Amino acid sequence: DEFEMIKRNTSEIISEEELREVLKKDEKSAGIGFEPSGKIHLGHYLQIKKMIDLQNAGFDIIIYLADLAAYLNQKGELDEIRKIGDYNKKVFEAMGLKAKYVYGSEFQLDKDYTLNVYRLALKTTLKRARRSMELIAREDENPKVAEVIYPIMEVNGWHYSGVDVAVGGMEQRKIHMLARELLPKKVVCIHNPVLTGLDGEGKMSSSKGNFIAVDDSPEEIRAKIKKAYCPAGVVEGNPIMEIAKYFLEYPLTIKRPEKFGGDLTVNSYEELESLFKNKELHPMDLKNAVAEELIKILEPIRKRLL
Ligand SMILES: N[C@@H](Cc1ccc(-c2ccccn2)nc1)C(=O)O
Numbered sequence: 394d395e396f397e398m399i400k401r402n403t404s405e406i407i408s409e410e411e412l413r414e415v416l417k418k419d420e421k422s423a424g425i426g427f428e429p430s431g432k433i434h435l436g437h438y439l440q441i442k443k444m445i446d447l448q449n450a451g452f453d454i455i456i457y458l459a460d461l462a463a464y465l466n467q468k469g470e471l472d473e474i475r476k477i478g479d480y481n482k483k484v485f486e487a488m489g490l491k492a493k494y495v496y497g498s499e500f501q502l503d504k505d506y507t508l509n510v511y512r513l514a515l516k517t518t519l520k521r522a523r524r525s526m527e528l529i530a531r532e533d534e535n536p537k538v539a540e541v542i543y544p545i546m547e548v549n550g551w552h553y554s555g556v557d558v559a560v561g562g563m564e565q566r567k568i569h570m571l572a573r574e575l576l577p578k579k580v581v582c583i584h585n586p587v588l589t590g591l592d593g594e595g596k597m598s599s600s601k602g603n604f605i606a607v608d609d610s611p612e613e614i615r616a617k618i619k620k621a622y623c624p625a626g627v628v629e630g631n632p633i634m635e636i637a638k639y640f641l642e643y644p645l646t647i648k649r650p651e652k653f654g655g656d657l658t659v660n661s662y663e664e665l666e667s668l669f670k671n672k673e674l675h676p677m678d679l680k681n682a683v684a685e686e687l688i689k690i691l692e693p694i695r696k697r698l699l
Pocket of ligand 1: 424425426427428457459497529541547549550551554565568
């Protein structure tokens with residue numbers, strides 16, 4: 394059903410009971426925001442895929458091109474940030490998402506909005522605001538006051554958005570917790586898992602250059618996958634298995650030379666995981682299949698961008 398379709402491949406739903414209450418409503422809205430990113434990667438796509446799930450489930454979708462957040466988070470000047478946000482919109486549209494796109498700065502600098510930001514700054518401890526930014530803040534040896542304005546800026550955004558559901562990666566959870574504690578309307582928070590970087594050494598991120606971009610060329614995708622961390626039998630923190638879990642359609646046919654066991658059809662990610670944990674499926678053949686199927690999945694996106 395819709396709940397299950399929404400829940401599929403999420404890390405958590407802050408409350409399932411509250412989301413069930415939302416799904417009874419006819420008019421319901423879900424939002425996500427992104428600091429504009431020079432490259433749109435599989436992390437982004439995972440969340441937009443989830444936004445599409447909600448859209449299919451009768452939700453109106455709003456995407457915040459979070460230009461002011463990105464400004465607060467040291468991404469550059471607003472005019473430049475906004476150009477990147479416009480590029481990001483194009484990618485999201487190429488992904489098949491029709492939604493309303495709003496630049497946070499269209500409303501986040503209004504006088505009454507600001508006064509509410511100050512109101513929330515009185516209710517939010519520095520310690521809690523800092524903790525909320527631990528996975529989000531730009532690396533800074535000398536953390537700026539802007540870092541603790543960021544979470545109250547976003548919390549007030551959620552308040553102003555009027556959405557019933559907020560979406561983001563697990564790293565967003567502490568900011569979302571603040572929103573649920575501070576605001577008169579508790580937003581349902583759907584968190585998506587954070588993908589491991591291709592080298593398996595941290596989470597996948599724009600600043601770490603450890604991601605596959607939705608517009609990477611086939612040859613780039615093949616090279617990135619060839620080189621990725623993918624230890625035999627190891628599923629945990631294996632970025633290739635995660636791509637297989639989050640992006641691929643099943644039944645999945647894995648091509649292999651007969652000398653390695655010949656073509657392999659797997660009817661679910663859970664079978665794939667079993668075959669991989671049991672070492673019936675070698676990294677090399679997993680990689681080849683994941684690279685080819687991923688290329689196919691991203692191709693219509695790469696094709697539109699042009
Ligand atoms: N914290 C997210 C960025 C992010 C996400 C959402 C919002 C927001 C929500 C409602 C209205 C306005 N803005 N602002 C910023 C990230 O790390 O990409």
